[PDB]
Symmetry: C4
Subunit: 315 residues, 4 copies
C-alpha cells in the first residue's frame, strides 16, 4: 500500500493548456526511454512515484515507446494498477500513433485504420478505459488531414480520449487540423514539438504564434536536447567550447545546465510544459528546481544565442 506525498500539490507550478481549462504541471514525465522491457520494473516504479510526489500529474506515452514497442504502455499499466489505483483521476495520461508500430501498411502513418486500431491496442496495454489525450504523433503527407481529424474526433466521441493533440505539425498543417476539428466541435488541445535551446524551429516557423492564436497548448519534447543541455558532455571542440560557456551562464544564475535549459523554455507563457525523460528519481528532484528561476535578462538571452551561433550548436 503506497500513500503519495500529501504535499505533492504544494510547490509544483501548473499552467493552463492553451485556452482550455486543463492545467498541466510545468514539468511532465515522458516515457520515451526507461520504461521498456529492457528496464527493471523496480527502477520504473521509483520514477513514477517520485514524479507524482513532486506534483507531476502528466505522464506522456506513445504506442511504440519501449523497447520493444508497446512495452512502456504495458509497464505503465502494471504500475498504474499496483500503485495508482486510487489516483487515476489525478493523472493526465497521453498516448499517440503515427510512427512505425507494427509491420505492414496499417502499422504506421495517419490513417483511420491505424489510429483507431492503435488506440484500442494502447488502451488494452495500459488497462485504461480512456486516455486523457490522444495524439496524432507525426504528419502523414499521404493521408488527407480530414481522415486523421475524423479519427481523432471518433476517439473523443466514443469516450476513448478526453482530448486530442498533434505532434510535429507545421504551423500551416496545425492551422488546418484546428479547423477540421472545429467542424466536429472539438478544440485541438495541445501541440507537442521538439523544442529546446538548440532547436528553435517552433519560434522561427512561427508555430508559437499559430498555437496562441488558436488557444492550443505547447509541450516541449527533448527540452534537454538528449543530454546535450546537461552536465553530460562537459561533438566538435567548438560545440563543446560553447556548451562550456552556456554552463558558465547557468552557474552565474545558481543553476545547473539542465535547470537553465528548462527555465529558458518556461520563460514564455506560450510553453505549457516541458517533457522530462527522467532515468532516475534524483533527476526529477533536480530538474523541478528550474521553477525557482524563470527570468532572464535581455543581455542573458543575447549571450545565450551568441554562444549557440559561435559553437554552431544549431543541429
Amino acid at each position: 500500500v503506497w500513500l503519495a506525498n500529501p504535499e505533492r500539490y504544494g510547490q509544483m507550478q501548473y499552467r493552463y493548456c492553451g485556452k482550455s481549462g486543463l492545467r498541466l504541471p510545468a514539468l511532465s514525465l515522458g516515457l520515451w526511454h526507461n520504461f521498456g522491457h529492457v528496464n527493471a520494473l523496480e527502477s520504473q516504479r521509483a520514477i513514477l512515484r517520485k514524479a507524482f510526489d513532486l506534483g507531476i500529474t502528466h505522464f506522456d506515452l506513445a504506442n511504440n515507446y519501449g523497447p520493444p514497442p508497446g512495452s512502456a504502455e504495458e509497464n505503465f499499466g502494471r504500475l498504474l494498477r499496483e500503485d495508482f489505483a486510487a489516483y487515476r483521476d489525478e493523472l493526465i495520461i497521453s498516448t499517440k500513433a503515427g510512427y512505425d508500430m507494427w509491420p505492414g501498411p496499417y502499422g504506421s502513418g495517419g490513417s483511420r485504420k491505424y489510429l483507431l486500431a492503435s488506440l484500442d491496442q494502447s488502451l488494452k496495454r495500459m488497462g485504461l478505459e480512456y486516455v486523457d489525450i490522444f495524439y496524432s504523433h507525426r504528419v502523414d503527407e499521404n493521408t488527407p488531414m480530414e481522415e486523421t481529424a475524423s479519427a481523432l474526433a471518433h476517439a473523443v466521441q466514443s469516450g476513448k480520449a478526453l482530448y486530442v493533440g498533434i505532434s510535429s505539425y507545421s504551423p500551416e498543417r496545425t492551422q488546418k487540423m484546428v479547423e477540421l476539428l472545429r467542424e466536429w466541435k472539438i478544440p485541438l488541445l495541445i501541440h507537442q514539438p521538439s523544442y529546446n535551446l538548440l532547436n528553435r524551429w517552433v519560434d522561427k516557423s512561427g508555430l508559437l504564434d499559430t498555437l496562441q492564436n488558436n488557444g492550443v497548448g505547447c509541450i516541449a519534447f527533448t527540452p534537454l536536447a538528449q543530454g546535450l543541455l546537461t552536465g553530460k558532455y562537459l561533438l566538435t571542440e567548438a560545440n563543446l567550447n560553447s556548451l562550456r560557456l552556456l554552463n558558465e551562464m547557468a552557474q552565474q544564475r545558481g543553476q545547473s545546465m539542465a535547470q537553465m535549459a528548462l527555465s529558458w523554455l518556461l520563460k514564455d507563457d506560450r510553453v505549457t510544459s516541458v517533457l522530462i525523460g527522467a532515468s532516475r528519481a534524483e533527476q526529477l528532484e533536480e530538474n523541478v528546481q528550474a521553477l525557482n528561476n524563470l527570468t532572464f535578462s535581455t543581455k542573458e538571452l543575447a549571450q545565450i544565442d551568441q554562444h549557440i551561433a559561435d559553437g554552431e550548436l544549431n543541429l
Copy 2:
C-alpha cells in the same frame, strides 16, 4: 420489503420545469447535509422514505456532499438498492461537479477532465446507469464555457445524464450556456441559485427573467436561509427585530416562519421547486404544508419587504 404510500401522488403539487415536459415536486429533497458517513443510515432511511411517501420525487445530490465527500452519494446508492429498487423510474436524481472534490488540478472547477471523471465517480458511488440531471455546480472563470458545455453535452449524448443543469451562474453566463448547449441541440433544463426571502440576487440581477426567457426552470437552494427563516434564532438587534416581525406575519397566516418562507418562493410561477434539507422525517411533513397557503396580498408582500429593509436583513 418496503411498500411506498399508495396515495403519495395525491397531494403534492408538481410544476413543469421551465418549458420542458419534466414535472418536479414543488418541494424537493436536498442531501447537502445529513447523508454522510457521520450520520446513521437508519435516520437517512427514514428521511428518504418519508419524502417519497409525501410525493417528493426529486433527490438532489452533488459529488462532494457528506461529509466526507462522496458519502451522500454512496449512502443514497445503498438506500436506493435496499428500498427503491422498484421505484427508480419514479425518481429524479441529480448530481453535480464544480466545487473541490478531490486533490490537485483536476479535482475542482469546470474542465472536461473533472466533469466527466467526476460524473463517472458519482454513477459508480450511486450504483446508477445515469442521473436524471447532471449540473455544473459553479462557474469556473478559468475554463471556457464552450468546454464545460461540451462536457455536459457529452454526458447526455453518452446516456449518463438525461438532462443538464447549472448552479450559481450569472444571467449573462446562463444565457451563454443556453446558447452553447443549443449548438448541441440540448436545452438547458434548470438553474439552481441560492434564493430565499432574504437573498434576492436572482431577481435584482435579472436572472429570473433570463430563466423564463429561455424556458429554464429554477430550483431554490437554501430557501430557509440556513435557519434564519425558521425562527431557530427567535445577528444584530435590528436583524432579530425584523425576524420576529416576519414571524408574526407568518402566525397571522396560520403558518410557521419556515412555511411562510417556502410559500413565498412558491407564490407564483417564477420558481419550479424549493430544495429542503431535512434532518428528520417530521420536518418534511411540516414543510410540505406550505402548499396549503401560497397566496400573498399586495399589502403582505409590501410589509414583508419593509420589515426586511428596516432590519437590514439582506
Copy 3:
C-alpha cells in the same frame, strides 16, 4: 423445435412504408388485447405462430398492453425466446410510450424521462437489444415536441430503435415532428391513426395529405371499429343496426364477410400501408388475410357504402 411455414412469404402482400425501404405486411398483428397475464400463454402462442406462418412479420406492442401493463411485452418476449429465436431478423417489432404506464409524473406523457426510461423497460421486458419501431403513443400538449423528438432521436442514435413512429398526432403536429426529426437527419417512418370505415378523421383532417407529402407510412389502428365492422353486433340504435345490416349485405354480394370488406376498404389504394388486426384466435387471422382476395371497389359501391353510413348516422 418449431419450424415456421416454408411457404409463409408466398401469398401475403407487402407494402413499402411511405418513402422508406421497409415493407410491412398489409395486415399486421396488434397485441393490444389477448396477450396479458389474464390470457393463457398457449392461446397467445397459437396466435403468433399462425400470424408468422401467414407472412405477418409485424407485431405491434406498447408499454401498457396487457392487462396488467407491460405483460404483453413480457409474454411476447417469452414466446420470442421459445419459438422465434431463429426468426427475430424476419420480424418488425414495435413498441410505444405516451399513455399511463406507471404511477407518478414520469409514468405518462411525452417527456425525455418517460420515453427513454420506458423504452429501457420495454427492451428488458421483451428481451430485445432494440425494437424496429419506437413510437410516441400520443400527443402530450405539455411537453415541447422538440423534447419528444430529441428523445426519439436518441433512441435511434443509441441503437435501441431502428426507426421511429408517432400515433394520433394531428396533421400540423405530424408535420412539426417530421421537421424536428429531420434536424437529426432521421425521417419519421410511420403514423398510426385510428382509421376505419366509420372513422375518417384521417381523411377529413388532411392527415393523409401530410403523410403523402412527407413520405410517412400509415398503419390503421382499430380497422374493425372494435367489432362494429364484423359479425358481432348484427349502445347501438335501431338506425345504426339497420345500416350495419345493409353494409353486411354489400359485403356478402362481394363474396366477403363484413370484416373482410372493412379491411379491403382500407387497403383499396396505397394510402394505407397496413391494417392492425387484433386477433383473439388463430382462425380470425386466416379469415382476415383473405381480404387481400378482393381489394377493388367500384365508384358506385364506394358511394353506396358512404350513403349507408350517413343514413345510419354511423360516424
Copy 4:
C-alpha cells in the same frame, strides 16, 4: 502456432485507396467461392496463409458467400481465431449486404433494417468487433439512397465498420452516395464493380471518372471473367479469340491470367483486383502480374481487336 512469412511486405505493391490514407494490396483475396461448408477447411487455411505470406492483406467477404449463405464468414472467422489472432490489425476485412441472404422482406435489398441486422449477423459469424469496410452490395431502387446511406453512416458512428463502400452502383448513384455520406462527414472509401478485359462498363459508363473526381477507390471484381481469361478453356469463335489473346500473353512472358490482371493494374485507375483463388499456387502465379504492368498502344489496340472479332462481351 503459425508464424507468417517475415518477408511478406517486401514484394507486394500497395496502392492508396482513392484519396484516403488506406493502402490496399494491388491483389486482394475474394471469398466468393471456395470458403463454404462445401469446401474442406484445410484447403481454405492453405489459401489464407499463402495470401498473407504474399503480402495480401485484404480479404473480401459478403453475407451470402458460401454455400450455404454465411458459411464463408463463419469459416473465415474460425481461421482468423486459429491462425490470425495476432495479425487482425494487419488485415483489411470487408463484408456486404444487399443481395438475397435470408427469407422474407427484410433479407434482401437496401433498407436500414436489412443492412444493420445483417452487419450484426456478419460480425457474429466472423467473431469481429468491426469490419474494416462495410458495403451496400447492390443498388436497391425501392429504398431511398438517404436510408441506405444513413445505415452505412450508423455502422461507422457505432464503431462496427471503419469505412464504407458500395458495389455496382451507376455513376449517377455513386455520385449521390458520395454526397449523402458527406452530410454525415464520411468519405465513400471504395466502389467494387465487375471489371475485366471482357467487361468494360466501368470505363464506357463514366464510372472511373466519377470515382477519380470524388477520390473514391476502385476494386475490380471477377478480374479474370470467371475463368475465361485464364488457361481453363463457349463458342468456336470465342475460343478462337481466347487463343489469340493467350498468344499475346505468351509474347509478354505471361499466362493469360497474368496479362488480364496486369491489364487492370496497368495504370492508377484501379486500386486492386480481387482474386478468387481455389488453391495456394494460384496466388503465387497471379501475383507475378506485378512484374509486367506496361502495355504499348499497339498491344492495347490488338487486345481490343481480338475481343471485338471474337464476340467477347
